[PDB]
Write an enzyme that holds these catalytic residues in place. Sequence first.
Site, PDB file in Angstrom:
ATOM      1  N   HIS A   1       0.779  -1.240   0.000  1.00  0.00           N
ATOM      2  CA  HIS A   1       0.000   0.000   0.000  1.00  0.00           C
ATOM      3  C   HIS A   1       0.820   1.306   0.000  1.00  0.00           C
ATOM      4  O   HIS A   1       0.241   2.392   0.029  1.00  0.00           O
ATOM      5  CB  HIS A   1      -0.968   0.019   1.189  1.00  0.00           C
ATOM      6  CG  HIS A   1      -1.971  -1.093   1.180  1.00  0.00           C
ATOM      7  ND1 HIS A   1      -3.203  -0.980   0.570  1.00  0.00           N
ATOM      8  CD2 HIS A   1      -1.935  -2.329   1.730  1.00  0.00           C
ATOM      9  CE1 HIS A   1      -3.880  -2.103   0.738  1.00  0.00           C
ATOM     10  NE2 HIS A   1      -3.131  -2.940   1.436  1.00  0.00           N
TER      11      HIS A   1
ATOM     12  N   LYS B   1      -8.933  13.729   3.947  1.00  0.00           N
ATOM     13  CA  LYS B   1      -8.020  12.582   4.008  1.00  0.00           C
ATOM     14  C   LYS B   1      -7.138  12.789   5.238  1.00  0.00           C
ATOM     15  O   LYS B   1      -7.085  13.893   5.785  1.00  0.00           O
ATOM     16  CB  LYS B   1      -7.147  12.488   2.741  1.00  0.00           C
ATOM     17  CG  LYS B   1      -6.385  13.778   2.397  1.00  0.00           C
ATOM     18  CD  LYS B   1      -5.661  13.723   1.044  1.00  0.00           C
ATOM     19  CE  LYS B   1      -6.622  13.864  -0.148  1.00  0.00           C
ATOM     20  NZ  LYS B   1      -6.732  12.586  -0.916  1.00  0.00           N
ATOM     21  N   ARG B   2      -6.450  11.741   5.677  1.00  0.00           N
ATOM     22  CA  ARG B   2      -5.513  11.873   6.790  1.00  0.00           C
ATOM     23  C   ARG B   2      -4.439  12.927   6.483  1.00  0.00           C
ATOM     24  O   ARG B   2      -4.046  13.102   5.329  1.00  0.00           O
ATOM     25  CB  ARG B   2      -4.877  10.516   7.118  1.00  0.00           C
ATOM     26  CG  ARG B   2      -5.837   9.516   7.757  1.00  0.00           C
ATOM     27  CD  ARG B   2      -6.226   9.938   9.177  1.00  0.00           C
ATOM     28  NE  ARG B   2      -5.072   9.881  10.078  1.00  0.00           N
ATOM     29  CZ  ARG B   2      -4.843   8.903  10.951  1.00  0.00           C
ATOM     30  NH1 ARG B   2      -5.692   7.888  11.067  1.00  0.00           N
ATOM     31  NH2 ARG B   2      -3.757   8.942  11.714  1.00  0.00           N
TER      32      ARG B   2
ATOM     33  N   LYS C   1       0.639  14.073   1.152  1.00  0.00           N
ATOM     34  CA  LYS C   1      -0.678  14.410   0.606  1.00  0.00           C
ATOM     35  C   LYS C   1      -0.799  15.921   0.318  1.00  0.00           C
ATOM     36  O   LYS C   1      -1.737  16.366  -0.360  1.00  0.00           O
ATOM     37  CB  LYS C   1      -1.788  13.924   1.545  1.00  0.00           C
ATOM     38  CG  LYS C   1      -1.903  12.392   1.640  1.00  0.00           C
ATOM     39  CD  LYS C   1      -2.907  11.976   2.717  1.00  0.00           C
ATOM     40  CE  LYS C   1      -2.926  10.469   2.965  1.00  0.00           C
ATOM     41  NZ  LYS C   1      -3.599   9.738   1.849  1.00  0.00           N
TER      42      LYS C   1
ATOM     43  N   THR D   1      -8.450   6.386  -2.663  1.00  0.00           N
ATOM     44  CA  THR D   1      -9.795   5.840  -2.881  1.00  0.00           C
ATOM     45  C   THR D   1     -10.826   6.947  -2.699  1.00  0.00           C
ATOM     46  O   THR D   1     -11.902   6.924  -3.316  1.00  0.00           O
ATOM     47  CB  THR D   1     -10.127   4.643  -1.953  1.00  0.00           C
ATOM     48  OG1 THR D   1      -9.899   5.010  -0.587  1.00  0.00           O
ATOM     49  CG2 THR D   1      -9.293   3.427  -2.304  1.00  0.00           C
TER      50      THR D   1
ATOM     51  N   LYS E   1     -14.455   8.122  -4.779  1.00  0.00           N
ATOM     52  CA  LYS E   1     -15.710   8.546  -4.134  1.00  0.00           C
ATOM     53  C   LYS E   1     -16.237   9.893  -4.661  1.00  0.00           C
ATOM     54  O   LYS E   1     -17.442  10.043  -4.908  1.00  0.00           O
ATOM     55  CB  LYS E   1     -15.538   8.626  -2.604  1.00  0.00           C
ATOM     56  CG  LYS E   1     -15.053   7.339  -1.927  1.00  0.00           C
ATOM     57  CD  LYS E   1     -14.679   7.594  -0.464  1.00  0.00           C
ATOM     58  CE  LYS E   1     -13.778   6.491   0.086  1.00  0.00           C
ATOM     59  NZ  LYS E   1     -13.378   6.773   1.501  1.00  0.00           N
TER      60      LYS E   1
END
EC number: 2.4.1.1
Lengths: 807, 807
Positions: free
Chosen positions: A348, A539-540, A545, A647, A651
Amino acid sequence: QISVRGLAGVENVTELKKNFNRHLHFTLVKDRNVATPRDYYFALAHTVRDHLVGRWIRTQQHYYEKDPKRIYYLSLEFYMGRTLQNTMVNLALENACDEATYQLGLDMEELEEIEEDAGLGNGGLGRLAACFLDSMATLGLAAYGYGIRYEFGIFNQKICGGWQMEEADDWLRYGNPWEKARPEFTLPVHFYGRVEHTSQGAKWVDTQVVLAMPYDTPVPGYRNNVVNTMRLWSAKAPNDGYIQAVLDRNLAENISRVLYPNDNFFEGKELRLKQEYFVVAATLQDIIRRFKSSTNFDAFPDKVAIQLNDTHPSLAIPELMRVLVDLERLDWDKAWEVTVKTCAYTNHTVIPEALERWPVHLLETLLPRHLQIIYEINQRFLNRVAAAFPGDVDRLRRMSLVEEGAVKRINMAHLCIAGSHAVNGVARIHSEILKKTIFKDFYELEPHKFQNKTNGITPRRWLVLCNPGLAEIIAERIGEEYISDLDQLRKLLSYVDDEAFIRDVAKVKQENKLKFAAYLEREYKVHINPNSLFDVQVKRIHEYKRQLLNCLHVITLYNRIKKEPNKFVVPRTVMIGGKAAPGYHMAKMIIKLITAIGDVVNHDPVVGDRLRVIFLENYRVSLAEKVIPAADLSEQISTAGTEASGTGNMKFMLNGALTIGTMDGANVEMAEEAGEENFFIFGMRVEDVDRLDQRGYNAQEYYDRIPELRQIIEQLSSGFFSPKQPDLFKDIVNMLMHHDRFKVFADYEEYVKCQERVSALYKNPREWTRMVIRNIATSGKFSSDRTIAQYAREIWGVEPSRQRLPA
Amino acid sequence: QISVRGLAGVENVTELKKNFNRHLHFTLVKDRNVATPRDYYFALAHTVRDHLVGRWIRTQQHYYEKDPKRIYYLSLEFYMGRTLQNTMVNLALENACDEATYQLGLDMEELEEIEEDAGLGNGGLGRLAACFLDSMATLGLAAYGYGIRYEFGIFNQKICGGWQMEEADDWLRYGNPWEKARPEFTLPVHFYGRVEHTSQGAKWVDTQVVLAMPYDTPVPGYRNNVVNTMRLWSAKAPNDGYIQAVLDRNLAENISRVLYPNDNFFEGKELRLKQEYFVVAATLQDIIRRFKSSTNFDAFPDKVAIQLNDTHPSLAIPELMRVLVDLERLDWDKAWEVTVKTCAYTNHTVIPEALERWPVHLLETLLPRHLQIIYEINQRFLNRVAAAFPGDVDRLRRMSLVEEGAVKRINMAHLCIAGSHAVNGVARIHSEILKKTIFKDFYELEPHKFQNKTNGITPRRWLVLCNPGLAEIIAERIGEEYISDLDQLRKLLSYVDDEAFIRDVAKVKQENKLKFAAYLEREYKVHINPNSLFDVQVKRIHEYKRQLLNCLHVITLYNRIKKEPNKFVVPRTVMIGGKAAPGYHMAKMIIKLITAIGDVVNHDPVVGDRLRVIFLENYRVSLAEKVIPAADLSEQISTAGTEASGTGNMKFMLNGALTIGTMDGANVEMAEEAGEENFFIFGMRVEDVDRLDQRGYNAQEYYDRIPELRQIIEQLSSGFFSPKQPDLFKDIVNMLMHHDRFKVFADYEEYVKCQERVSALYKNPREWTRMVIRNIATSGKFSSDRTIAQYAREIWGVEPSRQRLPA
Ligand SMILES: O=C(NC(=O)c1cccc2ccccc12)N[C@@H]1O[C@H](CO)[C@@H](O)[C@H](O)[C@H]1O
Ligand SMILES: O=C(NC(=O)c1cccc2ccccc12)N[C@@H]1O[C@H](CO)[C@@H](O)[C@H](O)[C@H]1O
Ligand SMILES: O=c1[nH]cnc2c1ncn2[C@@H]1O[C@H](COP(=O)(O)O)[C@@H](O)[C@H]1O
Ligand SMILES: O=c1[nH]cnc2c1ncn2[C@@H]1O[C@H](COP(=O)(O)O)[C@@H](O)[C@H]1O
Ligand SMILES: *Cc1c(COP(=O)(O)O)cnc(C)c1O
Ligand SMILES: *Cc1c(COP(=O)(O)O)cnc(C)c1O
């Protein structure tokens, strides 16, 4: 009201009402005179749960009779969210329960909000397991989810003075109506001890015993009457000063107490290792028991598949070997053949600090037999490397499961590759990077092992459940079959020039935004303009990110408004939400920055309602179901090569938002499906990041050449966003200028320009919506039904089936 | 089969069968193909529980409407035993459930054995609370039992090599179908902190908060449709490294983890004090809430009675004062008047080492406001003593709540007397001793406070449930009304010369003995002669209860047989059972001695089956229900003046055993009721013990004068009963010879002679049984219905009622 929510038959409604009243009286022991909304929620949950039971018993009985190959999905995380609405959706009970509750004078929507999330995961990896369970049940596979029943899931996030505070997630306080305790199936798990060598093989003795008690939760497929099981283990002390000995039972039971919330950095903590072995040892005993009821282990791989979600359950490999060799008395080579054919491993992330590299001294104390088995695996594996690449001594040290240095470590990823017949990444670009970089040596030795399985999301939870308005307007045109065959959404391309549909799509979005705007006012003290562009990054919180890149754009928009106040700009509501790992200082600083920006921007009279910055508190599955349907723009802006898939991106695409993003993870395949013209792509590609690494990244260059960027950094440094503590953000500035692994500055210019093109298109509602339709219509590939079908055929060796069981 | 077990109506049986199948399917999620006896037990328990619910809701609703005076029974112990059969008995469901289960192919007796005891008490005091709850419900009182939901009750006792081993009583492992969690009614409890004095009174601040979560259990009255509540509190941490903070929640939740098993010696352990305050603080908030829903506190004592079971909940007195003064702002004198009129205190022992005397330093740290309140109570109380007995300085120090010395202590018994309108002992002789000795000073100051309430036992559990055979043969003659009016057993005196009844009484006893003899063979590897006299001493192991005196007689019988092997002696099975407190060395030695005697006696070929010594393992409520109906002789042989009442004695009397005993506790009243000629009384009276204390007890005298006694001591000393460790019993011998507080030797001769008279009568079965009938017939006084009626009228100021609620 809504056709996709099923039929409300007179007999069904009558029956639900009386069973609701039965549970309120007999199950909850309450009279209607003192019952609260929570009581009403539980009565409904128990009524719906009853409808699962018959199907659950006969599904499991059916597997016992037909004896199909069984799929075991091992994960330390199952990020399930709420269960009530999902269950109603999958059983076609939603309209019936809505009618039944309305007739009793209750609002079902209000009751749904009472359910606690089952927050037994951190983010994407945990949520993937949850979507996968739904898809496996929908595709008729004999699948079992196995994990840990954490007493405390992911912490509740409170924002206090702009800082993240963590609060225990006591999700079990009021009970869990969905689970069934199975104390009769409690199994022993061993720790510590020592290895004894007898004439008749090795023996693991003098161990401490911890009991594993299973709790079963039903997993309903979509309207196929299949109900699979998620089995979660709870730690219990065995029954054998007196007071102190009883109180010390907590030491054993601590194993299942709390989910580890650290999703950035591998910590070799002993309690985490215990958790990993606990789930593995208990699960494997179950697998073997169930197999023995069908003892020649040649057929084991024909009846069992074990999927390892990351390296977290990697101890499955030496544990299976231990049981086969030490207990069943199989010779090594035969046991190894069985193990390899049984196990498969999913990776991952390529980020090196995420790799599980356990200190040898820890395994030696805790699992001495497993360390011996790991050493033997390594020797035999390295003999094969030596034979394949004679004289390549550097390869031998690179591929070893044992890493040398000041402290010796076991590389669990290397263990997983050696002991699995399949290794997959989670998006095409990610799987390619695995073969080219981090696992290159392994790919050269065994090319056949390496696969791609692009991630997906369940369209039940992520469309039908959270966005019924959109589900309905789609069903009106193309019917209901897309819900379990998402590829059918392609048929919507024939409606891209349909004026009625364009209006409907835009109407559903507006209604979603109004609902979310009101939700923000009702449960928090925040007002937003519902006409503005809803710009969402949820998101985290991580450096990779690049929530920080978003922050820079926000300040840029603010500064431009201050520069030219009387010029028109497309109004935006910028929403950023997500939890930071408790020990992750930089991520906690980023949250603080976001709120600090909000404090300035949201209170400047010159700005008005043209720009708002809101931090979304306590981001979790239930909040995702609310915000994603309301979004106009989806921020997917990780540095190219860092986000394995994503992911959340999928969505948003399914729910009518356009995407601004880098060519990273699944974004690449999303743009490929929709067409690049229908995506807002910007920034460095993987290759560009590589070239910049060659000559060396110098952030000062960008600071010197971009005046708008310079102004922002100076504002940060001088205390513009923190007047009382002028140097509050010095750590952030220092990182950006001197040691930014993720090259925030390098993508700044292209990001800002891309954002202008987004604003330009939003000024033309008709063309915005037409592009939206093009996205929704091509989102079919990203159904987890597709993902799971590929795992089934290419890894597990089983055929999926949409055929319904009799019920 | 049995008429007292109720009607088995065709509709009732049909309904129970279908609800049994409903629970098996929907509640337990099991198919009939894999269901086990445990599954079947739970399905039955849930089916019976359903019948309680309607009555439970309407009883509690009825109390809310009619607003009667409420009785709050505060105890740290509720020794409940099993609930299934008791519930069936009280609901008239026993025959119906027996038929329903038989028709499904199940044996209800077998299913009943699966239920775990709720072992939330140590012995007599805990069991008294349980009988009291049953009687209060049967007499229609608005009564509430309040205590702690211990996760672990009294330990399971294993006998290993003749030694007691303790094992955790994990009674909740499989769940408790009888309780209902009420997390919605969770209340805060405060610990530590400090006292702040403001202009507007005192304030307790900077406290640590522990949450009290209630669990409610129904308490059904005997066939009156009354169902009262037992509310037990569970400790929970509030929700506010990260991992460590979550794991440390166990520190708060340890409060309700384990029952303290020490029933011999007061230990001032902090955890015990926390338990005592926890139950008190949570309960009082409930009491006040319920009262405020009926705020002038003048009527508080007219609406509330609080009964303190021993001094364990004594903190109720200063806690009520704290709430009234600090929170409700009542003046001291008015609050004190209310407190005194509300509270009453029951004493259970005169033994000084049992008195709770808490170190001041502990209360200062843990409950600083309560210590201040206690000091003020003491000062005002001592001012009253000084005014009543001017110049009596010795009285002032004797009566003080504060005890002086190396460490200052609070005497909780003195606190209870000062703050209660009623103080009672638990048998006439005990209550007299309280007035004459330990509380003499208090009696002289306030004679009106001191009362007697002779203990009792519930004839539902202790006759109908455990001895249906005897209940039936009684009902055949005099009807069923005695079950709730035990005085009616007097009518059986007219059957003392009835040949049919004599035969029936003796038949029921023989059947009980055969059943218990078989039980011993089935679950243990022990065979007994069912024709022998069943000589039974079951109770907690204590020096004052003199299991050692029994041991001396057993060895005497053995030695006599070895002396004259060919002489006839009445065959005996001597059974001794009971748990020892884990820290009580001497009690653990006594258990060892008993088993050691057994090892010699049970394996001597010369003895044959004429004498057997068995230690009954794991004595608890469920075992008591089995052994007591099987007993011929009840051993109640405490040193006169030491056993406050006894209740085991009453259970044996009701079940057809004759009593050998001292004139101690309730034995005195038992002999008075039955007639001394119908009792085997022996030994020193209280007055004789006093006289022996005056001149000084010298055990050597008895050793020198009694050759049979000398032989026994020499056998103990030389290692006759321990060949491998000759000096094993040196501690016991030393104690007996040099520091025996309980004068075992002084009663030896009279005990042995009395035992010969017992054997003599047993040789004449007809005359034995006639004496048995005389005992059963006069056991009516010892119903807890009588006891509770006296509390109601003489202490609580409420009238009992046998009137049935509508259901
Ligand atoms: O969520 C992920 N990891 C964790 O939560 C995590 C969980 C536990 C330990 C970790 C240590 C380092 C990095 C991450 C973790 N990984 C995500 O997996 C998703 C499903 O495949 C991907 O879409 C996403 O790109 C990846 O970051
Ligand atoms: O069981 C009793 N006490 C305890 O279990 C107990 C429980 C807790 C602490 C103790 C400390 C010292 C002594 C006893 C205890 N007392 C018994 O109470 C019965 C009911 O009134 C009486 O029949 C019996 O004589 C008395 O010993
Ligand atoms: O021995 C058996 N006889 C009949 N059915 C069984 C037996 N063992 C398991 N089953 C069925 O298989 C189901 C699930 O078994 P598990 O997968 O072992 O938990 C059970 O609920 C039963 O319906
Ligand atoms: O406010 C009320 N309105 C009507 N009934 C109540 C109210 N409060 C308590 N009750 C009734 O009293 C019962 C027990 O209340 P408790 O004694 O406070 O737990 C409840 O189950 C209700 O039936
Ligand atoms: C989907 C989801 C994620 C994953 O989002 P990414 O943007 O792919 O990291 C994380 N948390 C929750 C609650 C989710 O639903
Ligand atoms: C009745 C009972 C007791 C009390 O017995 P005494 O002989 O009065 O001490 C103790 N334990 C249990 C299990 C009981 O039932």
